[model samples]
Target: SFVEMVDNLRGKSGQGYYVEMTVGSPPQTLNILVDTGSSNFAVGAAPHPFLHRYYQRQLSSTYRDLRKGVYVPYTQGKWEGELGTDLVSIPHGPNVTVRANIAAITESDKFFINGSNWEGILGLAYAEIARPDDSLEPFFDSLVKQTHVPNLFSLQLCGASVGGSMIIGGIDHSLYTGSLWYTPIRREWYYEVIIVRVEINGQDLKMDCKEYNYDKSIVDSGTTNLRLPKKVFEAAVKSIKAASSTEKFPDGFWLGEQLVCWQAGTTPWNIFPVISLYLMGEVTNQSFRITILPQQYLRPVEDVATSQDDCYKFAISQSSTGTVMGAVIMEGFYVVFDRARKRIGFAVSACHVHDEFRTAAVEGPFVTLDMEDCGYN
Candidate 1:
C-alpha cells in the first residue's frame, strides 16, 4: 500500500518529514523523523525535563535488550541510547509487521528528536551507513527485499503549505509537471550525485570537477546551508563578487558558524543574478540542470536576531567528503529520490510564485489530496 504521512514542526525546528509507525504488540503510535540524512533511530529524553513522547522499552512486551552502547553523533553532537527492537509495523491496511532494530535512548542530545513533534528518526538511507553493521539493517532495504512495499518512494513537498506528502512504494505522476529528469548517484552512502559544472549568472565558474575527478555533490535536506568544496566555494564567491562589481558590498560578508552571510539592505536579491548547476555529466550525456534564483539561494540567514536583514549561502570551509546540496537548493525545487530506478528527479515547484499547480491532471490516483503534493514557505 502507498502511504502518505504528513509532517508538522518539531518545536523550534520546522519542515522535516514524518512517518507513522506502530511499535509493540499492543501497538503504540510513533511519528518518526523521515530523515534521508541520518541512518538509525535516536529516541529518548532531552537535556531539559522532557514532555514529548518516545520509545519506552519498558512498556513494550516485544522489546529486546541489546546491552550494546549506541550513540548518534552528528554536526551538533551525540545522542546516546540503547540498541534494541520491538514489534514494529506500519498501518498497511491492517498493519503488516516490519523487522528492524530500534534505539530506546536513555539520553538525547539537546538537538535530537526530543522537544519536537517527531518521536524518533526513521532513517531512509543506504544500508552501508546503517548503525550496528554486525546486526542492524536499514528499514528501506528490509522493505524492498521482502517486497512488502515496492522498491522506491516519492516526495511531493510544496513550501510551508499543508499540501505535503511522501508516496511510499510507488510513483504518482500527477504530483509533478513534465518528465522526471533522472541523474545517477555515484555514492549510496549519501544521495551523492555528479555535479559536472556550475555557472554564476549563466557564466561557467570552472569548478574543474571533471579534471580533478571530484564531482560528488550530496543532496541533503536535513541541513540548512549549502556546503561546497574550498576551490568551488572560492570560485563561486569570486563570480558573485564580480557579478555585483558595481554594487556597494561595504558590509562585505562574514562566515557564520553555519553560513556565509552579509547585510543586504537596499541591494535587491534579483540584482545578484542566478546560479546554475549542470549535474550528473556533460550536456550531451546523462545530466540534469539545477538552477537557483536569488531568493532561493540567498535566503535570510537563521538566528542572529540583530541580522534579520542579512542573507547568506555556502559555508566558510569546503567539504572534506564532497559538496552538500542542503535546504538552499531543495527549497527552490521539488525533488524526488527514486531508489528503485536508482535515479533522482527535480522540477520547478508548482506552488512557487505561479500556481493552479498548472492544473496538472486535477486529482491523483494514489494520493487523494492533489494539493498535498502541491508543497514550502
Candidate 2:
C-alpha cells in the first residue's frame, strides 16, 4: 500500500519544510515541521512569543492530558511540554486517523522562529530518541501500526522549485529514475550512515576517511545545511577555492558570514564544481556516490539588498555534531527510508532535472579502501 503525500511543504531551500496537519475533535489546523531528526509530535498549546496561534486544548473534546512531562533539548534550543493524546490526521495524506500522543508545548526557547510558518513539529524518527523516553511511540510508528501501509517513506525535496512530495508507505517509482542505490543504516536512530570519502569535481579529497565521519554521519531531512566536521569542512573549502580558478572570495565567504553577489543577468553556477559523497554500501568493499551540482550548495537568496544584484549563500556549515546530509544535498535526490530493510535508498529526483542539465547523480559500486565500520555503539 502507498499514500501520496501532498506537496504542501512550504519553505525556501535554506529554511524548514512544513506540512499541514489536523488535530482534535473539530479539527484544528496547524503547519507542522516534518522533522526526521527527533521523535515527538509537539505543538504550541499556549501563547508563544513567535507563534501567531496555539492549539487551545480546551476547545477539543477528545484531548486528554497524560500528566506526563515532556521536554526536548536540541542543538540550539529547548522546549518543555505536557504529554497528551488526541485524534490526528494528515489532511493531504492517508485517509486513516490515529489517536496519537501529542506534546502540548507551553514553554520554549529559540524553538519557534519568528515569521516562520510552522507552528509545530512532527517527528518521523524511530522511538529510540523519543522525548520522555523510548517508551513513547512516535506518530509515524503509530500510523504504520494502525494501517496496512509499508514500513517506509520517501521524500523528494525540490529546493525552491515546485512539485515535490513526501510519499509514505512505499516508494513512488514515477518520481525517480535509474536504479536505487542502497546504503546500510548503521543505527536505527537518526538514519545513520557511514561516509567513506568525499570528492570535489571528480577529484578525491585525499584526507583520511575517518575525517569524513569524525563524530558520526547521518542523512537528516530536517537539517538545512550540509554540515561537516571542522577537518572535512576546511578541506572541502580549500578544494573548492583551488578548483574555482583564480577568483577571489571574501574572508568570511566560506564561513557562511558573507554573501556572494553577482549582477542580475549573470550566474556563477558554471564557475563552481560539483560535490560527491561516498556512502558505505550493503556489501563489503563497496560504496556508492551521491553527487550534487553547484546550485545546491551555493543556494540563491530570494531577496538582495538591491534588486539590481543577485546574491548566494553557502549551504554547507561546520558542525561539531559530525557530518549531516541535510537539505543542501537531499534536495537533489529522491530519498527513501526503508526501516524494515535497515537500508536507505537514493535515486535521482524527477523534478531535479533542468532543461539542459541534471543537478544530481547516484553512481557507484566503487571499491572501498581503508574503510572501517564508522557506526557508533
Candidate 3:
C-alpha cells in the first residue's frame, strides 16, 4: 500500500482537501482536490479567469486524445471537458504509475472557486457513476488493476491539523484505534449507505428511518458539511440550539451565513452536544453509530478577522436531496473504502485525540430492521 498526505486548501476556508499529482509523459504537476462525490479524474486543460494554470496537452508526449466529450453536474455547479488518456503518477501515493483516463475540463461555471489552491479534481468514486458513462473506469480501479495492489483505500481527515493521510491500497491499523465497524455499500455510486438513526446528545430524533433516507444518504468526502435533508437539518439544528450555552447566537449562524466569535482562548465546546448517526451494518439486523463532537461541526475560521477572538462557523447545512455525512463527520473517523468487498469501514481516528478528549466514537451492534432499497429511487 502507498500513503500520501491530503492537504486542506490554504487557510481555514473549509473549501476542501487536495493532493499533489503529476500527469503526462514529462510530468506536469498539479494540485488536485480529493473528491469522492464524482467519478471523473478531470483537470483544467484550458485557461480560465479563476484558474492559475492548466494542463497543456501539447506539452506531454504520452497524451492521447480520445475525442470524447464529458460533463459532470455537481450539487452546486457543472463542468464540461474532453476525454483523453495519459500517464498519471502520484509522488507519495501508488508505488506503480498507471495510464488512466482523464478529462480536460475547458468549460465550468462556479465549479472552481476563486482564490482556491487547487487546479483539478480527482474523483475517487466507482465507475457506476462515472461521467459520460460507467464504461469509463475510475482512476483507482485502473490503478489497482495495473499495480496488483489490494482494491481498497482508507482516509483519515485530521480537521485543523497540518493536513491528513490517505492509504491508497489497503488499511493501515496504526492510523486508527479499535476494530472497524463494517457497513455494506447500498450502492456503488457515491459510497451510498442507509442511515438507520439520528441522535442529538444521545437523544433519538424519533423520526422514521425512511425520513433520513428520503432521497439518498451518502458519506461523501468531497462535501464540506454534515448536510442533512431540510426536515432533518431543522431538527438537528433545533436540538443543538437547545443544548448549547451562551448568547447572541444569530439566525445567520444556523444558516451557515455568519460566523460566531468568542474570546481567543475560550471555546464553547464544554456545553455543546454531540451529534450521532447510525448506519446499517454488514450483518443482518445490525447497525453502528458514528458520533461527531462539537469541535468537528462548529469549525474554526482563520480567513475572517476577529481582533481579540476566534471565529467559528456552523458546519451543518441543509441538503435539498438527502443527508450527506461529509467532512465534518469524516474528520472524526478513519474511513475505509473497501471497493473489492463492496463495503465501508469506520473507526475512531488516532489523530482525532486531543489531550484527554477524543473527537469521535463508533459503537454498536444495535438491532435494526432490514431497510433495503432506501437510496436514490
Tens-place lDDT digits, model 3, residues 43-160: 9999999888899999999999998899999997889999999999888776578999999999999899887778898899889889899999899888988887788888888777
Error of 1 at 155 (Å): 2.1
Q: Could you tell me the C-alpha RMSD of candidate 2 in Å?
A: 2.0
User: Model 2: runs farther than 4 Å from truth?
Assistant: 1-6, 161-163, 353-359, 373-377
Estimate the TM-score of every prediction: 0.77, 0.94, 0.93
Candidate 2 on 146-249: residue-level lDDT in tens?
Answer: 88777898888886633367777888788789989999888887788888878898898887777788788888777888899998898888888887765787
- Scored against the true structure, residue 149 in model 3 reaches a CA lDDT of 72
Q: Give Cα distance to truth, residue 375, candidate 3, Å.
A: 6.0
Tell me how far the alpha carbon of residue 344 in candidate 1 is from the true structure, in angstroms, after superposition: 1.7
RMSD (CA, Å), candidate 3 to true, equals 2.3
> Between prediction 1 and prediction 2, which has the larger TM-score?
2
**Backbone clashes, candidate 1:** 8
- Per-residue lDDT of 318-346 in model 1, one digit per residue for the tens? 45555777655665355678786677777
